[PDB]
Amino acid sequence: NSVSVDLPGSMKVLVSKSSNADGKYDLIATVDALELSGTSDKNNGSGVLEGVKADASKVKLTISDDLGQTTLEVFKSDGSTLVSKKVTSKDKSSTEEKFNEKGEVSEKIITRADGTRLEYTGIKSDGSGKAKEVLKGYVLEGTLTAEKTTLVVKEGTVTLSKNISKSGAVSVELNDTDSSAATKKTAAWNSGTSTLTITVNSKKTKDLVFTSSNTITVQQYDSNGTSLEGSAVEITKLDEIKNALK
Fold first, then answer.
1. Cα 140 from chain centroid (whole Å)
2. Is 149 in contact with 143 (CB distance < 8 Å)?
3. Which residues contact 245 (CB under 8 A, 6 or more apart)?
4. d(Cα 120, Cα 115) in Å, to the nearest integer?
5. Residue 226 belongs to what domain range?
């Protein structure tokens, strides 16, 4: 009879085998234990389904025409104002939002395809808030503004800041208040290799690489300050970032 279709966001929809008198297909889905229904112009599982929560909040599932993306929305019981929205994109990343009484976003959780996350909480009407990046093994914390996200790690008099611009560009900086010329760390950022090179006493000491896989690696220079030595080591815990800043 109906045809089962797998969707982004770990959902399924059942589509009628054939169309009704108007040419439209019936759609059914169950999300959690909520039954959703709709009709569609297409026969592939795309379209809109609707239902309600046990508390009468409206629910809408929207499946893009090519099945690439899904959106699951919850609204107030009159259907007017959004309460929550989850969008799963074609890479299987997701964004999950909560909204306040005016429909303004108050929380946004971005889950990358690899499972790492950006968590934005306490978001205010100017787009400022608290930020966390959840990586494999550890979490980075900081703040959000409409210009950038800034995640910070402190060790001694060193502050490491990982910035994510509004447009998604990562850059990293290091600032040290150390008053001793012999021990003060400085660093340079290379956007072309996503690498922060730390210097102490006029010699390169370490490269910190912020990889496309959402990891951080550390590699030391030889005592000559010009050649790398050994091989890069992936950071697995926050304490190891702090160790790289010593």
1. 13
2. yes
3. 153, 155, 156, 158, 160, 174, 185
4. 16
5. 101-246
Q: What are phi and psi of 229, to 5 degrees?
A: -125, 160
Method of structure determination: X-ray
DSSP letters of 145-159? -SSEEEEEEEETTEE
Q: Determine the Cα–Cα distance for residues 3 and 26; give it in Å rounded to an integer.
A: 11
Number of domain units in the chain: 2
Q: In which residue are the tokens 């040290």 written?
A: 176
Give the span between the Cα atoms of 6 and 63, in whole angstroms.
11
| Residue 170 one-letter amino acid | V
Same domain, 43 and 110: no
Cα–Cα distance for residue pair 4/28, rounded to 1 Å: 10
Q: What is the CATH number of the domain that holds 169?
A: 3.90.930.1
> Where does residue 61 rank: exposed (0-12), middle (13-18), buried (19+ CB within 10 A)?
buried
